[PDB]
Amino acid sequence: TLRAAVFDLDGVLALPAVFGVLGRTEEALALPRGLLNDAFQKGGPEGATTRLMKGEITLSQWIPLMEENCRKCSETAKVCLPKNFSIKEIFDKAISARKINRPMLQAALMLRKKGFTTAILTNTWLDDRAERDGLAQLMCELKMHFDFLIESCQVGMVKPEPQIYKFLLDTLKASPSEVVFLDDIGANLKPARDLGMVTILVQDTDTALKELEKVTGIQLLNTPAPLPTSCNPSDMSHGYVTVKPRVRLHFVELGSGPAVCLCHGFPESWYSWRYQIPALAQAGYRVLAMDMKGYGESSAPPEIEEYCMEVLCKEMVTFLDKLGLSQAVFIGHDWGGMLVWYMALFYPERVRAVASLNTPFIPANPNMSPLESIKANPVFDYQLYFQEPGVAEAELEQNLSRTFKSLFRASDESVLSMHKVCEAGGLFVNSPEEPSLSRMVTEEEIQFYVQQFKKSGFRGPLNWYRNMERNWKWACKSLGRKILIPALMVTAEKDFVLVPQMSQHMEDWIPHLKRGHIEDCGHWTQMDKPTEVNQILIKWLDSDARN
Amino acid sequence: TLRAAVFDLDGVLALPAVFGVLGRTEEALALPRGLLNDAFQKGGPEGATTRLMKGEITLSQWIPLMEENCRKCSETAKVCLPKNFSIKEIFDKAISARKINRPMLQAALMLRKKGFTTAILTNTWLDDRAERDGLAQLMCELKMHFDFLIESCQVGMVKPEPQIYKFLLDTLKASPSEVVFLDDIGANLKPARDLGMVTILVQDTDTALKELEKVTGIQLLNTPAPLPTSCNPSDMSHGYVTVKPRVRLHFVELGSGPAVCLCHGFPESWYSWRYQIPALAQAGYRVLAMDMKGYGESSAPPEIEEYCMEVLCKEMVTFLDKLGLSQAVFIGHDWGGMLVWYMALFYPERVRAVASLNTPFIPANPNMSPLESIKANPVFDYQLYFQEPGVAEAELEQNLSRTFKSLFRASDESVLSMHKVCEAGGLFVNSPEEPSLSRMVTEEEIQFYVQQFKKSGFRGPLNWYRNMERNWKWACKSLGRKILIPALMVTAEKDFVLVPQMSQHMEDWIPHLKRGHIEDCGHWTQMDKPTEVNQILIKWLDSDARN
Numbered sequence A, B: 001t002l003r004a005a006v007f008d009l010d011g012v013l014a015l016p017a018v019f020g021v022l023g024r025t026e027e028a029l030a031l032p033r034g035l036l037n038d039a040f041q042k043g044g045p046e047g048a049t050t051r052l053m054k055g056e057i058t059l060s061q062w063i064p065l066m067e068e069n070c071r072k073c074s075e076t077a078k079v080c081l082p083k084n085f086s087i088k089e090i091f092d093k094a095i096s097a098r099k100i101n102r103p104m105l106q107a108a109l110m111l112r113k114k115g116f117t118t119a120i121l122t123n124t125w126l127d128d129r130a131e132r133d134g135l136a137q138l139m140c141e142l143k144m145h146f147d148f149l150i151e152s153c154q155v156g157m158v159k160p161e162p163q164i165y166k167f168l169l170d171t172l173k174a175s176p177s178e179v180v181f182l183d184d185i186g187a188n189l190k191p192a193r194d195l196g197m198v199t200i201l202v203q204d205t206d207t208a209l210k211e212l213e214k215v216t217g218i219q220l221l222n223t224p225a226p227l228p229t230s231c232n233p234s235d236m237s238h239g240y241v242t243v244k245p246r247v248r249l250h251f252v253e254l255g256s257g258p259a260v261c262l263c264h265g266f267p268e269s270w271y272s273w274r275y276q277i278p279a280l281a282q283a284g285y286r287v288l289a290m291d292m293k294g295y296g297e298s299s300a301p302p303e304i305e306e307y308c309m310e311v312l313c314k315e316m317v318t319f320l321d322k323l324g325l326s327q328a329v330f331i332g333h334d335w336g337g338m339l340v341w342y343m344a345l346f347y348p349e350r351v352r353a354v355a356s357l358n359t360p361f362i363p364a365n366p367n368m369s370p371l372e373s374i375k376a377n378p379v380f381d382y383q384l385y386f387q388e389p390g391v392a393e394a395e396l397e398q399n400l401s402r403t404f405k406s407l408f409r410a411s412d413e414s415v416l417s418m419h420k421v422c423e424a425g426g427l428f429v430n431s432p433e434e435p436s437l438s439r440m441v442t443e444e445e446i447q448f449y450v451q452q453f454k455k456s457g458f459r460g461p462l463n464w465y466r467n468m469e470r471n472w473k474w475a476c477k478s479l480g481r482k483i484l485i486p487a488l489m490v491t492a493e494k495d496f497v498l499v500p501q502m503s504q505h506m507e508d509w510i511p512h513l514k515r516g517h518i519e520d521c522g523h524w525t526q527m528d529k530p531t532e533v534n535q536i537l538i539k540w541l542d543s544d545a546r547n
């Protein structure tokens, strides 16, 4: 049995196939059947196309050698070509017309997720056209899901030559019977079979998947929608900005385009956005996923007043200042959510657009003190338990694994009351020592949070709840203002603390506020309904944060 | 005598002044003199404009309150306004029309450079228009050169109220006689004088500078062109990407826009680009200034083969891969220069444009070995001295301060032969123990390089010279190719090693190659002629690296 799987690019991981343009163009312009394909293949291994694929010449170099073959292919078949037959124009459109074959990719993902070493094996070229970035993009999205990407124009060998299959095996460190190989060209499979490999001719994807499903014994066709791409922390760009003598902010950076700044909640990290970071990068954005002050690799100074909203917000502006950014899109969840509204309200010149999950914009009531406003909500009782420094820390720090396993739970699997937490004498008092693992998290994912809170503990994070009076006096400066910058509010049906009802009055302060809502979704929106969050955020971003 | 200097924004650090649009618009549309200014000032401290400046309302909020004042200002003066009189359209154009008053900024820089604490004091607003980014940009470029930026709409006080001058002093931690204050409005100066401060009414800049020059006793007017902005290493965003189990690459990141990747030479760091990093950011780019493998905070593994071009180049591709970048503009100097040409030649899908200072693209000669090709140039003799592992390291590491002070020298102040270095028995054998400080570097700037090479030493850096045969066999793969991507070659007149002559044949391989040349310029181009380098690179970038 086999533990490797190798995929062809053109016509297998990517569709429609560029070879199909040779056929398509002919039919379209009423050219003799085969005429272009002859010109493409002219010379065999000694010909121009093979040289290109071996990386001796670039694409722009090959373009005229091909057009030159087409004029003499057409001479021998006694015809000529139209006045503006442009081979650059044919291959430009063909290559961008090519998209990822999603079912084939998901199938490669599933296999690897179940222990297979996966690789791409493609005959491709050194693309030096002006519009080459379109291809390089597709390759960056595709290659990241595979252990190896063997490109012909880099190894100096080409399918269907036996030597590149020897290379493939050396790279996979695997004997030929332990490997499947899918391709759309039969000639490319005969070398694989002679060495012993399992081979599949891809025509339609579904039958190709059916066969692969058979010989692997793994459900590939018709399986459920998988989660988005997570992030491997060791594979990320980690950034570090000193904003102040004693405060350094850490963040994870992925993608290019407009800066998008992701601000997590309590008690979380940048990893809370693992399912969003790759999506939005791919969507066309520069994701800057924070460790907010107090958490992880960001500084966590002891003082309570260091976590008031005004200080926190100034620091985020300095963060932009020092990164050379005039603006960013700001997207918050939980406490980050609140912060982000206050950024749009005090520093709108620096916010491209504002967006919050769960947390509504709540103005300060200038008559009534916050202490009483919080006291008026029985489900906010847990916040009063947090006020006394050291008490809440002791409990949360006692057993970091327990703490995270009992917090990170979906609406339909809870263990934790929020009312009567002071009275009961703690958060976990009626919840177990070893809580079950939630469906939202792997064991490994939990231990990441465990490591982060081994650094600076919970006093920093908790201090965010301990400036209620200070944030109130600040907030009251903004009571004459409105938010007229692009602004999205995303409610979660079954977040029993930040209830969607709390958001109902937001239109008074934010007139062109747009909305998103998620059915069956607890407090931990990002990992609970990642696909719906990714989708809602991308639509908004594309319509509300562009030139 | 005084050790502080405070500058007004509108009409002082930035011109033309927005108040001048009130006057300008009136004249332009044939409105009664003053009519707009009355509407602007309607109500005094109780009026709409003051509220705006105190930060009670945003700009978009104020816009209609102003238009509403204009309809009733025009009623009392028995006139009406044209059909499409738009106050948003007036203030949109006014604000972007505003540029930095460069002589005033240079004057503030000089003062601070000579020990003055400097600050901006401006009546300004919470800008929430769609085109607010234009302003936020100007403020980011301006604020970075001052110790404090006191904006009225943030402190809740406004000129000319005595309380904001009390704030100013508290912030400067300085008594009123130790501070100058420049402004274009006389009313704003009377509070400063009553407290005791020195005041200057700015009308024309040159006379305002003349006065400031007097009362400070520092040459401000007519002084020479200063260098560009350097970088304070503690103020930068520092990034860190693992590209491979044992190799982490460190880089400094500043700005937004297309990714521009700066690759330093031997034996240098990211700091070698200090004069370029802020310029290009401001020019509209995302500068990623590397520590190349072997140097500083980047990993420096012992093995010689880890610094061959092929490995180095693959690693840089992974660097892009993991940062989510499909391309970058690549700009190299010295060894970075060579690397960058080989990136354009092996991975053109990933290079937006290629650019080298000093280092020409030299193909491998397929007949003749590199050992002999290097041996054929008497000024390359120093490279042979480098081949034997440990020898060159011992000398360079013996006295790090000496080493850098004797390398980093301008064409007209040298101490170092390159011919006969093997024969003579070392680089420094006829150069002093305490070499003089070059005009290109401060003492502090030298000690930065000293600290970096205390980490991993010189063996890593030197290994870049120790794969001459391996790079040659690699290079010979590319002899059938050309570089048809945008490509700039910048020669340095008096670089006696990488002589401009070496670049003369580059057009054969690179047909649309563009050029730059710098008179009176040694090997260390970036710090020798920073302004000319910045200027040459920005022109090219704007024409050759955009959509």
Ligand SMILES: O=C(Nc1ccc(OC(F)(F)F)cc1)N[C@H]1CC[C@H](Oc2ccc(C(=O)O)cc2)CC1
Pocket (backbone or CB within 6 Å): A266, A267, A334, A335, A338, A359, A362, A370, A373, A374, A382, A407, A416, A427, A497
């Ligand atoms: O509640 C949370 N997060 C949270 C709640 C529970 C939780 O689980 C556990 F408590 F830790 F066990 C973990 C995190 N965050 C805050 C609550 C306050 C809210 O902001 C408000 C809302 C209303 C008022 C008011 O009307 O007075 C004030 C602040 C921002 C988000």
Ligand SMILES: O=C(Nc1ccc(OC(F)(F)F)cc1)N[C@H]1CC[C@H](Oc2ccc(C(=O)O)cc2)CC1
Pocket (backbone or CB within 6 Å): B266, B267, B334, B335, B338, B359, B362, B370, B373, B374, B382, B407, B416, B427, B497
């Ligand atoms: O020479 C330098 N840098 C340098 C030279 C001198 C120097 O001062 C000191 F030597 F360290 F004292 C410090 C750095 N870099 C290399 C030289 C080789 C060049 O690439 C070539 C050029 C020609 C050939 C060939 O024709 O064989 C090969 C490689 C890339 C830049």
Ligand SMILES: [Cl-]
Pocket (backbone or CB within 6 Å): A143, A144, A146, A147, A148, A149
């Ligand atoms: Cl890969």
Ligand SMILES: [Cl-]
Pocket (backbone or CB within 6 Å): A439, A440, A441, A442
């Ligand atoms: Cl999971």
Ligand SMILES: [Cl-]
Pocket (backbone or CB within 6 Å): A497, A523
């Ligand atoms: Cl909860």
Ligand SMILES: [Cl-]
Pocket (backbone or CB within 6 Å): B143, B144, B146, B147, B148, B149
């Ligand atoms: Cl500042």
Ligand SMILES: [Cl-]
Pocket (backbone or CB within 6 Å): B439, B440, B441, B442
């Ligand atoms: Cl200097």
Ligand SMILES: [Cl-]
Pocket (backbone or CB within 6 Å): B497, B523
């Ligand atoms: Cl030199």
Ligand SMILES: [Mg+2]
Pocket (backbone or CB within 6 Å): A008, A009, A010, A011, A012, A183, A184, A185
């Ligand atoms: Mg194929």
Ligand SMILES: [Mg+2]
Pocket (backbone or CB within 6 Å): B008, B009, B010, B011, B012, B183, B184, B185
């Ligand atoms: Mg002024």
